[PDB]
Amino acid sequence: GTGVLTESNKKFLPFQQFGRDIADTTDAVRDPQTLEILDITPCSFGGVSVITPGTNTSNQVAVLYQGVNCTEVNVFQTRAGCLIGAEYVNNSYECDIPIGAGICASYQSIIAY
Amino acid sequence: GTGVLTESNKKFLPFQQFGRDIADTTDAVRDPQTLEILDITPCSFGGVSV
Amino acid sequence: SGWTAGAAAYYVGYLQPRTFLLKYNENGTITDAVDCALDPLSETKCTLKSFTVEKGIYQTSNFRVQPTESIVRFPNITNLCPFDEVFNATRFAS
Amino acid sequence: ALGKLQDVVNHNAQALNTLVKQLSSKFGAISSVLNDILSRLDPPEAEVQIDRLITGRLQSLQTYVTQQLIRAAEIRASANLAATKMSECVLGQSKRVD
Amino acid sequence: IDRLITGRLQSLQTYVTQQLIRAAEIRASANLAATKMSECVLGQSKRVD
Amino acid sequence: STECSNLLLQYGSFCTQLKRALTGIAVEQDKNTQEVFAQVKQIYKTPPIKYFGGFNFSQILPDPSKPSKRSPIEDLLFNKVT
Amino acid sequence: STECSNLLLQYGSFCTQLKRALTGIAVEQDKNTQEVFAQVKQIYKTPPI
Amino acid sequence: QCVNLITRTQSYTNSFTRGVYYPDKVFRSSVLHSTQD
Amino acid sequence: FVIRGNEVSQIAPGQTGNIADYNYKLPDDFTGCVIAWNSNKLDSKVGGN
Amino acid sequence: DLICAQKFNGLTVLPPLLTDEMIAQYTSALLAGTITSGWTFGAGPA
Ligand SMILES: *[C@@H]1O[C@H](CO)[C@@H](O[C@@H]2O[C@H](CO)[C@@H](O)[C@H](O)[C@H]2NC(C)=O)[C@H](O)[C@H]1NC(C)=O
């Protein structure tokens, strides 16, 4: 399996080796060589959205990493995700390209507001 | 396949043999004996309603 | 110095398994193309199957950090396993 | 201004194009062409290959018909609204706000 | 792997189909709510109930 | 392919179900057009002199010069939808 | 799994269809909120008394 | 008769948009075709 | 019947071969059993049966 | 741990475009227009 192996606070009983979640996917593991419980988490991932104006207008793009903090990926942190390539502007305008959570983007460079 | 082979106004490039539609359906072919282009039109069909 | 002095200039590149989007014109010649992976905008062009992308926000793919190395964890106990007692036995049972 | 009708036309054309594109899918079989599977294979596992193509094409066709049914329900709701507007805004004067 | 793909694909298509039907129901409810916003809040309605 | 149809016969009435559903959709479209547009059983005509107290309806009334007998607005709507 | 995705490529445009349907539902929800609540383009204020 | 006469220097440059070939022998007209190759 | 040793795979539905096409053809929807056993003691001669 | 199990298998929840405070600001504008101006703001100037 692929993931990160971290410290676990799960009190495994001595007979128990594997750990499973509500999804019945491998969540914790007991190493045979040293009898310690390793918490398995999937590596960092998320969805990628490309914010663009028309190609008749410009070829500049912005990238939204959805549900991803900006420390684990012009960098702006939204509730929708981490936005790269768009600068935040404190001025409020009508929504042009919807990002989410009240944030929209427009081309004027690409700004987010 | 099965279809009529009508005359084609398409000018193929000489390495190409088969031809396809926008929805990748074969619409044309070059003939190997005589280097000419033929439009493949599969045979006439219809819904019969009573 | 038995041979005439000369020079030759040539470029060498290597091929990788990539997804491309090709534009076929009305004469059948590939006139333009986009590489999907290299550019976000070009990945949007590959997703929309078009060279002109309208204004909007487009779900294209998923970012994922790749694994860096492989670790194999097996028990430390090493014992020679007696398969010779099974398969090289002179007499078997009914 | 005329986006909505164009969207309806686009959705119908896109669905039909997608359905024709689903005839090029192997669906885990050796080929997407039935005649090729006939030509390169003897019958008793060609039955399995053609069965895989048949269940893939049934899945595509049922997906298309279900999407068409949902879109038909949406268009029927829009047309019932349009008939209500024809009765109440054109054939009379309405006190209903907006 | 092909059996797992066809099972998971059928599960995903089932989920998307129920999501589309629920989206149609919620769109009908939201169109009703927009009508009530226009006719009960932005005006006085003589339609009974 | 005839043996493909022989294999398709083993799956039952799936094709009949899909054909029946699409026939229902097809008749529902014509039905929807009938409740939207066929709301009067009398085909009314405007008078030959189109004076209505200064109100101009030429952009919504049909154009006799055009073969489609459509209004200028309706002709624009038909040209702008492809 | 890379080979599982390679086998999934042989099933065609099913995943594109599911993503397109869910994107339509997702923009439909925001459209529903716009029809219900964004019925005025002026943000009116109550007087302080 | 193997004799050594050639020396060679090298630099690195940009491929730009070169190197694209026809993935098959199929005529296609005014379309967009996506291929993995 | 009696056949050659490499021809026992041809006694099967949908097989292509010499005896499958010209001697014994099985239908595609065949139901039943095939039995094969050697006959050197009875169906062979030292001068050639 | 249901949300993490959904997220780890590719099922993500997108946020709504309007936040709760913006929907509340829309309803406050509707309240203020209705109380201060009646039905007149729905048919033109308040
Ligand atoms: C009613 O409207 C039509 C169209 O708006 C008027 O026709 C225009 O008349 C002016 C002046 O005669 C011309 O310059 C325009 O080219 C006409 N437009 C078209 C589309 O024909 C018409 O004059 C108006 N009044 C009456 C009484 O019909």
Ligand SMILES: *[C@@H]1O[C@H](CO)[C@@H](O)[C@H](O)[C@H]1NC(C)=O
């Ligand atoms: C080897 O594995 C056993 C468990 O099977 C463990 O008890 C022991 O401590 C391990 N030895 C070392 C040197 O880690």
Ligand SMILES: *[C@@H]1O[C@H](CO)[C@@H](O)[C@H](O)[C@H]1NC(C)=O
């Ligand atoms: C093939 O045979 C035909 C028949 O004569 C001839 O016209 C043609 O030139 C030949 N060669 C090719 C490459 O088609």
Ligand SMILES: *[C@@H]1O[C@H](CO)[C@@H](O)[C@H](O)[C@H]1NC(C)=O
């Ligand atoms: C295509 O073919 C026609 C006819 O041979 C030629 O005139 C034209 O220059 C070609 N190229 C393009 C881009 O149309």
Ligand SMILES: *[C@@H]1O[C@H](CO)[C@@H](O)[C@H](O)[C@H]1NC(C)=O
């Ligand atoms: C197996 O048994 C034979 C005698 O029966 C012996 O000669 C041979 O060395 C044995 N092989 C192994 C691998 O023990």
